[PDB]
Design an enzyme around this catalytic site. Structure first.
Site, PDB file in Angstrom:
ATOM      1  N   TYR A  49      65.595  93.229  18.998  1.00  0.00           N
ATOM      2  CA  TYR A  49      64.753  92.126  19.396  1.00  0.00           C
ATOM      3  C   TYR A  49      64.156  91.528  18.153  1.00  0.00           C
ATOM      4  O   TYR A  49      63.612  92.244  17.322  1.00  0.00           O
ATOM      5  CB  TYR A  49      63.649  92.583  20.354  1.00  0.00           C
ATOM      6  CG  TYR A  49      62.561  91.560  20.609  1.00  0.00           C
ATOM      7  CD1 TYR A  49      62.868  90.242  20.882  1.00  0.00           C
ATOM      8  CD2 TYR A  49      61.226  91.937  20.640  1.00  0.00           C
ATOM      9  CE1 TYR A  49      61.864  89.303  21.144  1.00  0.00           C
ATOM     10  CE2 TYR A  49      60.220  91.024  20.916  1.00  0.00           C
ATOM     11  CZ  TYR A  49      60.544  89.713  21.169  1.00  0.00           C
ATOM     12  OH  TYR A  49      59.539  88.820  21.412  1.00  0.00           O
ATOM     13  N   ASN A  51      62.004  87.957  16.603  1.00  0.00           N
ATOM     14  CA  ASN A  51      61.461  86.624  16.493  1.00  0.00           C
ATOM     15  C   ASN A  51      61.769  86.083  15.104  1.00  0.00           C
ATOM     16  O   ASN A  51      61.101  86.447  14.133  1.00  0.00           O
ATOM     17  CB  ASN A  51      59.950  86.643  16.748  1.00  0.00           C
ATOM     18  CG  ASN A  51      59.611  87.019  18.180  1.00  0.00           C
ATOM     19  OD1 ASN A  51      58.885  87.984  18.433  1.00  0.00           O
ATOM     20  ND2 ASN A  51      60.128  86.248  19.122  1.00  0.00           N
ATOM     21  N   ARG A  95      63.935  76.968  26.544  1.00  0.00           N
ATOM     22  CA  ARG A  95      62.780  77.164  27.370  1.00  0.00           C
ATOM     23  C   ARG A  95      61.475  76.872  26.639  1.00  0.00           C
ATOM     24  O   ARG A  95      61.467  76.547  25.456  1.00  0.00           O
ATOM     25  CB  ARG A  95      62.789  78.599  27.915  1.00  0.00           C
ATOM     26  CG  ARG A  95      62.621  79.660  26.854  1.00  0.00           C
ATOM     27  CD  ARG A  95      62.808  81.097  27.399  1.00  0.00           C
ATOM     28  NE  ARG A  95      61.962  82.010  26.638  1.00  0.00           N
ATOM     29  CZ  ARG A  95      62.377  82.794  25.642  1.00  0.00           C
ATOM     30  NH1 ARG A  95      63.659  82.821  25.275  1.00  0.00           N
ATOM     31  NH2 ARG A  95      61.501  83.561  25.023  1.00  0.00           N
ATOM     32  N   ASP A  97      57.641  78.851  26.355  1.00  0.00           N
ATOM     33  CA  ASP A  97      56.755  79.957  26.726  1.00  0.00           C
ATOM     34  C   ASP A  97      55.306  79.560  26.478  1.00  0.00           C
ATOM     35  O   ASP A  97      54.971  79.067  25.404  1.00  0.00           O
ATOM     36  CB  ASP A  97      57.077  81.229  25.916  1.00  0.00           C
ATOM     37  CG  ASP A  97      58.410  81.866  26.299  1.00  0.00           C
ATOM     38  OD1 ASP A  97      59.159  81.255  27.081  1.00  0.00           O
ATOM     39  OD2 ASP A  97      58.727  82.962  25.767  1.00  0.00           O
ATOM     40  N   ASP A 128      64.824  85.213  19.441  1.00  0.00           N
ATOM     41  CA  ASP A 128      64.174  83.945  19.786  1.00  0.00           C
ATOM     42  C   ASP A 128      63.945  83.098  18.565  1.00  0.00           C
ATOM     43  O   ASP A 128      63.418  83.591  17.569  1.00  0.00           O
ATOM     44  CB  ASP A 128      62.820  84.177  20.489  1.00  0.00           C
ATOM     45  CG  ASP A 128      62.978  84.408  21.980  1.00  0.00           C
ATOM     46  OD1 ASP A 128      64.049  84.037  22.511  1.00  0.00           O
ATOM     47  OD2 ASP A 128      62.036  84.941  22.614  1.00  0.00           O
TER      48      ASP A 128
END
Lengths: 145, 145
Positions: A49, A51, A95, A97, A128
């Site tokens: 994961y 960022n 998207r 957030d 992301d």
């Protein structure tokens, strides 16, 4: 938050048409739980994961640690997915957030394009991409990058 | 530029396998020309270009103006596309762009995930998502966001 002018119906979230696209949309819905224990169930042991371009978390343990720490200082108040699609084993979400800083109560809208790789229905990769200028202020943790 | 650990051979640039994917890769190659007059040829009249979440350029004129202005202060020295893929009429590029500030000679690596929408082989939408923390310093233009 409103649908942007460039939104395309052909790739709307409601048009998800593969198992992986659907799993990712479920995960997007679960983000507002602010619950690392709930969220980590979506990940494989062999996973990551990140960022971008902050230091990535590799392995399920590191990912859970990162998510938990995050939910200690920030709430995900909303996730609006404009597009979902997939190609060559990767799933894409365009998207926004909405993040809220727990210590200050200030809200932030982040425009995000994220890529997911799933193996046998479990997340093996989540990256992301978005502007981190306000992420520094929004998250009361050192970014380390 | 080094291949990231998460790179998938399945979605590599050299595996581009639709007309749109190949076009976007050609455009990625053309970026290093630093030539707005060359680049605007890839765009449709009805189009948009945005570095999220900065103010978008709508229409071909505004896009060409923006590109020209950027190339006045920055060189795109390299574009390395790790993944290209496509879905529901959109093309995705996971890449790194190397930008060089003309007044200072300082170089910057940006991790970028970009979405492209094409109509009849022409760009109708181009949105790049990445961290703008260094973009401010890298580009000797006022940010409008």
């Amino acid at each position: 938050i409103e649908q942007p002018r460039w939104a395309s119906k052909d790739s709307a979230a409601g048009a998800a048409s593969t198992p992986d696209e659907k799993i990712v949309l479920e995960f997007m819905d679960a983000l507002t739980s602010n619950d690392a224990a709930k969220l980590i169930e979506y990940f494989a042991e062999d996973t990551m994961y990140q960022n971008m371009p902050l230091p990535p978390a590799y392995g399920r343990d590191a990912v859970e640690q990162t998510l938990a720490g995050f939910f200690t200082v920030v709430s995900v108040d909303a996730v609006e997915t404009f597009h979902i699609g997939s190609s060559n084993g990767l799933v894409y979400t365009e998207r926004v957030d909405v993040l809220r800083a727990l210590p200050t109560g200030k809200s932030y809208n982040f425009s995000i394009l994220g890529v997911f790789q799933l193996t046998e229905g479990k997340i093996t990769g989540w990256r992301d991409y978005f502007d981190l200028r306000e992420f520094e202020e929004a998250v009361d943790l050192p970014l380390r990058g």
